[PDB]
Symmetry: C3
Subunit: 201 residues, 3 copies
């Protein structure tokens, strides 16, 4: 009728116990395990590992272990990427991160959800909607980005926010659920934290 991997790209409900899906997760979870168990001095091994576990990684990437994901091969990353401890990405489908992105500790990305009505999820049915993170975005600690959410370039997501809707570019959004609190103006070019200014030359 309609293979399982096609329902995924169509945004329809599906299950993932076939078509080599399980085998893919294994290869992935395997690489992830090597990475999470590598010694802090195994810098080279860690470097090539990330290049192999993610679908696409730009130059100057650095991920602080542990890192958790479903396949890993559905995650595409740009340049100068940086993620602190416990980054979790549920990538049953595509996850794209722009350039110069910064992710604080314990952040969680999920393109997958489950039908709310217990009827549609009897067999653990799920749906997947890609997540797009712009360039020069900065995610706070303990943030949670839900399915099909887009974060516009240059935005900032406060610590602890639950993002369930796209966030426009050039704004500071935060809250549960996440909401735009204000746009990044030129004052932000002088004041970097509370009452701290930054002199020009």
């Amino acid at each position: 009728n309609m293979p399982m991997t096609e329902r995924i790209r169509a945004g329809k409900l599906f299950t993932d116990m076939c078509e080599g899906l399980p085998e893919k997760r294994l290869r992935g979870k395997t690489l992830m395990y090597e990475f999470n168990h590598s010694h802090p001095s195994e810098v080279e091994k860690r470097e090539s590992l990330i290049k192999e576990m993610f679908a696409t990684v730009g130059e100057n990437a650095w991920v602080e272990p542990p890192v958790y994901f479903s396949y890993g091969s559905n995650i595409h990353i740009g340049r100068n990427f940086y993620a602190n401890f416990n980054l979790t990405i549920v990538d049953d489908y595509t996850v794209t991160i722009g350039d110069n992105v910064l992710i604080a500790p314990n952040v969680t990305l999920s393109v997958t959800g489950h039908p709310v009505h217990h009827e549609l999820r009897k067999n653990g049915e799920m749906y997947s909607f890609p997540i797009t993170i712009g360039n020069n975005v900065w995610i706070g600690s303990h943030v949670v980005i839900n399915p099909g959410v887009t974060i516009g370039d240059n935005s900032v997501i406060g610590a602890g926010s639950i993002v369930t809707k796209d966030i426009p570019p050039n704004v500071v959004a935060a809250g549960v659920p996440c909401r735009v609190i204000r746009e990044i103006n030129d004052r932000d070019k002088h004041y970097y934290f509370k009452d701290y200014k930054v002199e020009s030359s």
Copy 2:
């Protein structure tokens, strides 16, 4: 007068550095360590490890390591249980999980609390009130379930909510503190996510 293990069941303040409580945690914490450090392929080992660490597990159970708990012998799970990375269960007392429950990444269940007045908790004193999760319950990412809470059947707990009170069955609840936002009606039988419908068969 009244032994420590009896205060626990009576919901009174207690400490746990005696009566074998320490020993119990050591056995539990040992199996947990073997589980968490287990290679992705060690599927059979993993399957028996969970059977030996939880007081009760039903058929078709799956727990994505790492998992964290205090004893593991105070956790009782039904059938077709599924939990993602970093589930954490502080089980100084009973925690009962129903049938076909789904647990997203980084969730924390805790039956233990500390008295608010620093006086009463001079020695780390604590109290424990059992948590009960109904059947077909779906818990979002980064949720926190507090002592004595009861989640009714078929309910959904949005991502990031702090549940501090009983959640009735058949509702979608969320927020900090978690509040019921709506009852699950028949429209949810048709619309699974946002504007996505699902044709009959």
Copy 3:
């Protein structure tokens, strides 16, 4: 002109890929790794490990692994300190915890933040502001403490609150963002949980 480490203490923007900073992070991430991968029965090793990785530790301390930090040597802890699973402390600068402090599972402390304007953080520039936690402080699960924050003695930070502002002593604070909800009175000396009193004798 003005060395990177001096800007840190001055609270100016800085980057840390020099002046042995990276090297320092390695020694720390090394001890940290030994700690997190240590077997539950390695009680003595665990104990000398926490003495060696933190700047200062008071007697009767206990940290349930895993534990995550940046350097570890900028962290100062008092007496009878207890931390549950997954405590994250980003310590690019001083972090001070007082006496009899209780931290629940999955808490994140960070003295570092990034300038909101993508121009100032083109190179991942950062700023660090020391965190100070009073005596007899109990932090609930999944809380996040942002830079420069100060929590007064005897206070309780409810589960899931994001602390962006100083919390006065003797208060129950909670919320996103954390807000004072009430003062700890004398009723808190009789009632410990909901409707549970404690017979003085």
